[PDB]
Amino acid sequence: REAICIHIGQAGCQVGNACWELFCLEHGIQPDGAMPSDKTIGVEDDAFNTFFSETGAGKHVPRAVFLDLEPTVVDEVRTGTYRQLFHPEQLISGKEDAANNYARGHYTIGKEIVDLCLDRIRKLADNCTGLQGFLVYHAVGGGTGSGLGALLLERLSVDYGKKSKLGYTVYPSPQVSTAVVEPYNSVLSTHSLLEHTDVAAMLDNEAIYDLTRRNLDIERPTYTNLNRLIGQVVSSLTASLRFDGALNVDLTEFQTNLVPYPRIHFVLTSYAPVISAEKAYHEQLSVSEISNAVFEPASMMTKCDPRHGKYMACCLMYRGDVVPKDVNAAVATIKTKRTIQFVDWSPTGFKCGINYQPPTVVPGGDLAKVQRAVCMIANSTAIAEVFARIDHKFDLMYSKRAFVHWYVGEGMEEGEFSEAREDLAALEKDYEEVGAESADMD
Amino acid sequence: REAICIHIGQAGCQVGNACWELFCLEHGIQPDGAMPSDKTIGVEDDAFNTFFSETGAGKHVPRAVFLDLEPTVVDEVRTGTYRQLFHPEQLISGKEDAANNYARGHYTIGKEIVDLCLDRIRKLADNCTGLQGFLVYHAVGGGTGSGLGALLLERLSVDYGKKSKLGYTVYPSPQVSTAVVEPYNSVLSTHSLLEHTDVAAMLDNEAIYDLTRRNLDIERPTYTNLNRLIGQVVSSLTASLRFDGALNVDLTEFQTNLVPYPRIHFVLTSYAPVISAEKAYHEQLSVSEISNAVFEPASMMTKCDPRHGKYMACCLMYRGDVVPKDVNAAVATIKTKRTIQFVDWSPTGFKCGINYQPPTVVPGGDLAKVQRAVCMIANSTAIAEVFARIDHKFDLMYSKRAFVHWYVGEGMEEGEFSEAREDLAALEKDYEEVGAESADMD
Amino acid sequence: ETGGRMMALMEQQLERAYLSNVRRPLGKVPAAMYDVQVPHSGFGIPSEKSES
Amino acid sequence: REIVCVQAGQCGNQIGSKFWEVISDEHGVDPTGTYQGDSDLQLERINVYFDEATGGRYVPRSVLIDLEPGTMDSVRAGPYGQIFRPDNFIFGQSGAGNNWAKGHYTEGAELIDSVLDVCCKEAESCDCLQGFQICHSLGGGTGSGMGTLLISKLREQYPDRIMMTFSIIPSPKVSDTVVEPYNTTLSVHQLVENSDESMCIDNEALYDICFRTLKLTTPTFGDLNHLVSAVVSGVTCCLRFPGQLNSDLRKLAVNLVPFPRLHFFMMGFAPLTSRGSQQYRGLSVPELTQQMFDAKNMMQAADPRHGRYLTASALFRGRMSTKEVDEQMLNVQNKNSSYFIEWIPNNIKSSVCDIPPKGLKMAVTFIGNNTCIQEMFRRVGEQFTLMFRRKAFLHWYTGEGMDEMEFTEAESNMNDLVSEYQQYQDATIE
Amino acid sequence: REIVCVQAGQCGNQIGSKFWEVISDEHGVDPTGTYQGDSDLQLERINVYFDEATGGRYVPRSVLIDLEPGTMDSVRAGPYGQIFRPDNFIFGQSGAGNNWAKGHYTEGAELIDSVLDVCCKEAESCDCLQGFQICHSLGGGTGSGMGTLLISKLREQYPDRIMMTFSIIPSPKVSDTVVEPYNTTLSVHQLVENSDESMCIDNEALYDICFRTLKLTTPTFGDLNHLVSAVVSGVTCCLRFPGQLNSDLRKLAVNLVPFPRLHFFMMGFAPLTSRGSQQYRGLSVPELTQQMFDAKNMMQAADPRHGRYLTASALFRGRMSTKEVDEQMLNVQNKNSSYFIEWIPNNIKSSVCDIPPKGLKMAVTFIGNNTCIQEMFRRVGEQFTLMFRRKAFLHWYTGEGMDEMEFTEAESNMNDLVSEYQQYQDATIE
Ligand SMILES: Nc1nc2c(ncn2[C@@H]2O[C@H](COP(=O)(O)OP(=O)(O)OP(=O)(O)O)[C@@H](O)[C@H]2O)c(=O)[nH]1
Ligand SMILES: Nc1nc2c(ncn2[C@@H]2O[C@H](COP(=O)(O)OP(=O)(O)OP(=O)(O)O)[C@@H](O)[C@H]2O)c(=O)[nH]1
C-alpha cells in the first residue's frame, strides 16, 4: 500500500517538483504539511499513506529523497515555498557535478555520496508496513543521472532483492539535442538498466513538444509544461493504489501482464484528453473517442511510430465516470482496426483498469477540466528503432575515439564501451527474434 | 440520417455561409449554437441531427469542414458573426493560393494540406451511425477548387468506397467570364469528376443573374443573392431527410431514379416561386401554376435550352401545403404538352415528393413568403451543348500551347491535356448515342 | 540605462497589442476571444443512466 | 504574405519616399511609427509591409542603396524619413558617373555583398516570403547597373519567388543624359532574362496626364512621383484587404503572360479628374471603365491605337456589384473587338476589393499587355545603332572593362524581343 | 565553487580592473566594499568571487603581479582600486624590457616564489576550489614570461583542477612592438602543454567591433577591456545563478575538446547594437542566434567561413523557451551543414540561465572551436621565420642565456599545432 520515490539529478528533481505539487493538491495537503480542518471531519481515511506519512502531531511529510551532486536545484527546494513540506535530511546534495561524465558519477564522486542515500532509504523502509515498490526518476543523457542512478539501483537491487523497481527515464530525442556526449552516456546507462529494472518507461522531449504544439496551442513551451504532463501520467498509473474503483490494478499486475521475457521490459506511454478550454467546450468526450485517440501516434509521449511494429501487450487505465461496457465496446472496436496489429502469440492483448477519481486541475495549469481520462503503457517492437539510431551515433563517434580520454582519465577501461555496445546489439537481436511473424512446422 | 458537408475554395466557402445561415434559421439554432424556448420533458425533436451534433452542455455544432489554401476567406469566417458555431479545427487554411493552376493545387501545394482534411473527415465519420453521403461545393474554374477537389474526391473515393458523393458545381458561364485560363481548368476538372461523383448538379452565374433581374426586381445583383438562392435549393433537396411528409425520398432513391447509365449523371436544377414581396400578395400561387413554371426556361439556374434535347428522368420536390391529387393532375397536364419530350425508353418519366415544411424566409432576404414551393432536378441530353462550347474554347487556346509552360513547370507534362480532351469528347459521344431513337423493336 | 519602474511598466503595457504577443505568448495557451464557462463536473457528455 | 522593397538611385529613392508616405497614410501609421488607425481592418494585415519595433512602433520593410549620399540625406530629412531603420541605408563614396560599366563592375562589386547581406537578413525574418518589389530608372547609371546586378543576385538566391520591377524608361523628346541608349539597351538585356514582370513608365506620358487631365499649370517631380505611387500601392491591395473576388501577384502573372518573354506591361489609374469638374458627375463603373480605357490615361508614350491587347487586368476598389463589372468588360470587348486578340476567348480579368483609397468612393487600377510596347524599344534601338556604328563614346566603357561583344549581344537580344512582339501582333489561324 | 584570478602585466592588469568593476556592479558591491544590492540572489553566491572581511566589507580573491609598479599604482589609485587586499600586490624594481628571457629566467625566478605563496594561501582557504583564471598578453615581456612560468607552477601544484587563460595576441596590422613574434612563439609553446582551455582575442577585431557595430567615434582601451570583461564575466554566469539547464567549466571542457591539444577557442557576445539603432529592433532568440554566428561579432581576425566547427557552446541568460533554442540550433546546423564536422552528430551545446546581465532583457555568450585559428598562428610563424634566418635581434635573448635550440623547438611545436588543426579540416569519414 506504499511507494517510495527517488529523484536523481536535474531532470528528475524538476519533474519531482511538479509531481509533489500535484500529489499535494490532489490529496489536499497544504504547502506547510498541514491539512485543513474540514478535510479531516466526519470520516477517517488512509489514502494519503501511499505517498505521505503523518507524524503524531498530524503534520504530513512526503516519502521521497532528492539526490544531486550540484547544490543549486536542492538549494532552490530548500529556500523556496515548499521548504517546510520536506524533511531536511531527505534533501541530500554534494559539492560538484558529474560534468556529463558517466565515469565521474559512477566511479569517482557518487561512491562518496551513495552510502548516505542508502542510509536514508533504509531508515524510510524500516518505518513502513506495506512497501510495494520503488519509483525512480532520472535522465540517461547526463552524467550523474546515468552513473549514480546505475550505482544506486545496483546497491538497492542487492539489499532489497525481489521488490519491484519502476523507472521513468528521459532518453535523448532523435533530432533535438542538448549535449555532445549523450550517446555514450545513454549506451552505458542502458547496460546497467537491463539487469536492474522491472519496467522502464521511455520519454522524449521532442514528442511532448509536438503534443503541446498540436493539441494545446502553445508555440513556446518550457520545462514546467512537460513536467506537469509527466506528473499527470504518474498520477494516472498510481491512482489505482489510492482510490476506489471497479477494476483495480496492483503494481505487481503491471509487471506480470506487460513483460513476456525478462529482457523485453521497455514500454511506450501516451495520454488522451490533452485539450484546451476552447476545444473542450466544442466537443463531447465519450469513451470511444479517447480510446481511438490513445492509439494515434499524435498522442504519444515518445518519438516512435507504432505502425512499424507489432504490439505484444497494452494496459489501458480509465479514470473518472466510465462504465465497463463502453470500455469493452471500445477495445473490441480497436481490435477490429487493420492498422493495429498484435503478435500472433499474444491473442488476449489487453489489460483494463477503471477508477472513479477524475483528474485534478492545477491553478496555473494549461489542461482543461474533464470528466474522464485514459492513460496507456504498451510493449511494442517499434522501440528497436530508437536503439538503432543511438547505436549509429555511438558508432560514428567511437570509430575515432572522439572524446574517450575524459572517460579513461576518470577511471574507466576503454573495453567497457565495446561490452555495452555488444549488449545493446544483443537487445536489438532479441527484438528481431521475439517479433518473428511465424515459425515453420518443419 | 447524417450528411457531411465539404467546402472547398472561395465559391464553396461563400455559398457555405449562406447554407449554414439558412439551416440554422430553419432549425432555430442561434448564431452562438444555443436553443431558445424550453428544454424540459413533454416534447422532443431530432430534425437537427442530420446537420448538427450536440455537446453535453447542449451547445450545437455543425457537420462541416471549411477548406482553403489562402487564409482570407476562412479568417473572415473566424472573425465574423458565426465565430462560436464552428470548431476551430474545422476551419483549415494554408499559406498561399493555387494561382489559377490546377497543376499547382494538385501536384505542389495540395499534397501537403490533404492529410489534415482526411483526418477531419475521419473524425466526423466516426461520430455517425447512419451516414448517407457527402455534399461537396466547389467551382471548376479556379485552381484550388479544381486541383484539390479532384485529389480529395479521389482519396475520399478510395477510403470510404460505396458511400455516395453529391457535388454542387459552378461552371464557367458561356459569355460571362472571370479569368482567361478557365477552359483548361474546367476540362481537367471534368476528367476527374466523371469517375468520382454519383450525381453532379450544374450551375452558371449568368442564369442566376438573368433570373434575379427578370423574376426578382433587383437591378444590380451581387454574389450574396446567388448564394442565398443556392442555399434555398440545397435546403429543398435535403428537406426530405429532416421533416415529416406524405412521400419521402431517401438519397439512394435519387441515384436509383435519376441515373440510367453510370456515366449519365449530370443534372439541371430549377426553382419555381422566385417572387418579390410586392408581387406575391397580388397573385395566388397554386400547384398547377408553379408546375407549369418549373418547365419554362426562364426558371432554370443553368444556361441551356431543354427544347434542344430529350428528358430521361425528372425529380419533382413539392414542399408545403400540397395534396398528392393536385400533383398527379399537374404531372398529367405537363405530360400532355407537345413542347416537352421524353426519350421513348423512359415511359414513367417522373418521380414526386411531398413534404409539409414550407420554405423559410430570411430576415434580410429578397424572396417573398409563400405557402408552397417546388424544386426540380432533371437529366437531359441538352447538357452536351454546355461541354461543346468549353471544348471549342479549349481547342482555340490549345492550338498555340498558349499558357502551357506554367502547367508543365508545375508538374503536369503535356499529354494530360490531350487525354482529358479525348475523355470529354467520349462523354459528348455518350450523350449522342444515348439520345438516338431505337431503329426497330426487332 | 533603465528609466525605472513606471517607464518599464508602460513599456510592457504598449507591447501586448502586438499580434505576436497575443497569439504566441511564453509558456501559455493564447487567450480566448470570447467567454467560456467550465461546467461543475467538467467538459464532455455525462454518462447515460439505466434502471436497476 | 509579405513583400521586401529595394529602392535604388535618385529616381527610385524619391518615388519610394512618396510610396511609403502613401502606404503609411492608408494604414494610419504616424511618422513617429505609432499606430493611430481607426478600423481593425487596417491593423489585421499591417504585417504585409511592416516589421514590428519596440513599444508600439512599426518599421518599413525597405532597403535604400545609392552611390552618393546626397539623395539619402534628402530622404532622411523628409517628413517620414525617421521611420526607416538606420542600418538599412547603404551608400558609397563616389558617383556612378552616369556610366553603366562603372556602376556594374567597379563600385557594384565593392558594395553588392552588403546589400545582399541586408536583403537576406530581412528575407530570412519573414514567415512566408512573397515576391520582391524594386524601383529604379533604366536611363541612369547606378540605377541601371546596380539594379540589374542586384536583380541577378536575388534571382539566383530566390528562384521560386516572384520578381517584380518598376522602371522609368528614357523619353524620346527631352534627354537629361547623352549616353542613355547604351544604358537602356544593356538594362533591358538583363531584365528580359532575370525578371518575371516589369512595368515601364515614360516621363512624357505623365506630363501629358498632368497637363490635359489635371490641368496643372506648373507640375513638379512631387506630382510625378505621386502618380507613380498611386498605381504601385494599388497593385498589392488584394494581398492586404478582404474582397468578393481575391487576386494575387502570382495569379496576375498566370493570367497575363502567354509566353515567358512577353512580360512587359503598361499601367494606369482611373479616377484622375480635376477638382472643378468633380462636383458635376458621380463615380460609377461605366465612367471608371471609360476613363480606364482612354489612351489619355495610359502612362506609356506608345498609344494603344497602334497595337492590340493580348491581356489586361482591372482591380476595382470599393463597394460595387459584380454584374456591373462583368457586363462592362463584356461590352468593351464586343464593341472594340478589333483591338482584342482573337484567339484568347476573353482578354480581361476582373477583381473586386471592398476598401477604396481614402477620399474616393471607388477606384480601379489597370494593367495592360499591349503590342504597342515595340515602339518604345524600337526608338532606343535606333538611337543605339546610330551611336554604335561610329564608336561615339565607347572608350569610357571599354576603359572600365566592357568587351564590345556584350554590346552586340544586347542589341541582338533587344531586336529579337521587338521581333517577337511584331510576330504575335500579325499571327493568324491558317 | 570559487575561482582564483591572477592578473599579469599591463594588459592583464588593465582588463582586470574593468572585470572587477563589472563583477562588483552585478553583485551590488560599493567601491568602499559595502553591500548595497537590491536582491538576495546577489548575496547567495557572492563567495564564488569574493572573500568576506570583518563587518560589511568583501574583498576580491585576486593576485596582482607586475615588474614595474607604474601600472599597479595606477590600478590601486583607480576608483574601485581600494577594494583590493594590500598584501596581494607584488612588484619588483625594474622592467621586463620587452624581453621574454628576462621575464622568464632572471627576475621571474626572483619574484615567483612570493606569488606562489600568495596563491597557495588563497587556494588552501577555499572549501572547494574550482579552476584558476589568468589574464595576460602573449606579445609582451613580463606577461609572457611570468604568466607561462606561473601557469606551469600552478599546473604542477593543482593538476586535478581546471586551468583557464584569457590571452591577447599580436596582430600584424597594428603592432606596438618589433620583437612580438619571438615572445608569441615561446608563449604558445608553453600554453599548449600546460593549459586546459585558452581563449584568444585580437585587438583588430575589437576595433572593428567598435567602429562597424557600435559606431563609436573615438573608442579607447577602456572600451576594448570592457568588451573582454563582458565575455569573461559571462562564461562563469551558470556557476553563480540558478537556471533551467545548469552548466560548469568542466562541463564546457568535456563537451568542447575532442582531443587534448585542440583547446583553443573563439569568443563573441551577441546583443551589441548602437544607441541610435536600439529603438528599431527587439531582442529575440532568432536575432541573438543570427548575431551570434555572424563573423562580424567574433573577437579574432580569422573568419569561420574558411574553416569548419568541430564544437561550439552557447550560454543563454534570460527567460526564454527551450523549444525555440533547440530548433534554432538545429536549423543553423542543418542549413549550413558543410561548415560542421560530419562525424559528430550534434556540434552545439546549449545552456539557459534565468538571470540576465543588468540592463539587458537577454544575452548569450558564444564559444567556438574552429580550425580557422590556424591562420593566425601561421602568420606569427611566418614573421618569426623572416626574423630568425638573419639573427635579427637574438643577442639580447642569448645574452640573458637562452640556447638557440629553444627557438627551433618552439617553432616545431607551433608548426605541429597548425598541422594538427589543418589535418582535421581536410579529411573524409572513410
Ligand atoms: N523534461 C525535462 N527534461 C529535462 C529537464 N532538465 C533537463 N532535461 C533534459 O535532460 C538532459 C540533460 O540531463 P541532465 O539532467 O541535465 O543531466 P544531469 O542529471 O544534471 O547530469 P550532470 O550534468 O552531470 O549533473 C537533456 O536532454 C535535457 O533536455 C527537465 O526539467 N525536464
Ligand atoms: N456563386 C458564386 N460564384 C463565385 C463566387 N466567387 C467566385 N465565383 C465564381 O467562381 C469562379 C472563380 O472561382 P474561384 O472560387 O475564385 O476559384 P478558387 O476556388 O478561389 O481557386 P483559387 O483562385 O486558386 O483560390 C468564377 O466563375 C466566379 O464567377 C461566389 O462568391 N459566389
Ligand SMILES: Nc1nc2c(ncn2[C@@H]2O[C@H](COP(=O)(O)OP(=O)(O)O)[C@@H](O)[C@H]2O)c(=O)[nH]1
Ligand atoms: N519620375 C521621376 N524621374 C526622375 C526623378 N529624378 C530623376 N528622374 C529622371 O531619371 C533620369 C536620371 O536618372 P538618375 O536617377 O539621375 O540616375 P542615377 O544617377 O543612376 O541615379 C532622367 O530621365 C530624370 O529625368 C524623379 O524624382 N521622378
Ligand SMILES: Nc1nc2c(ncn2[C@@H]2O[C@H](COP(=O)(O)OP(=O)(O)O)[C@@H](O)[C@H]2O)c(=O)[nH]1
Ligand atoms: N586590449 C588591450 N590591449 C592592451 C592594453 N594595454 C596594452 N595592450 C596591448 O598589449 C601589447 C603591449 O603588451 P604589454 O602589456 O605592454 O606587455 P608587458 O610589457 O609584458 O606588460 C600591445 O599590443 C598593446 O596594444 C589594454 O588595456 N587593453
Ligand SMILES: [Mg+2]
Ligand atoms: Mg546537473
Ligand SMILES: [Mg+2]
Ligand atoms: Mg482564391
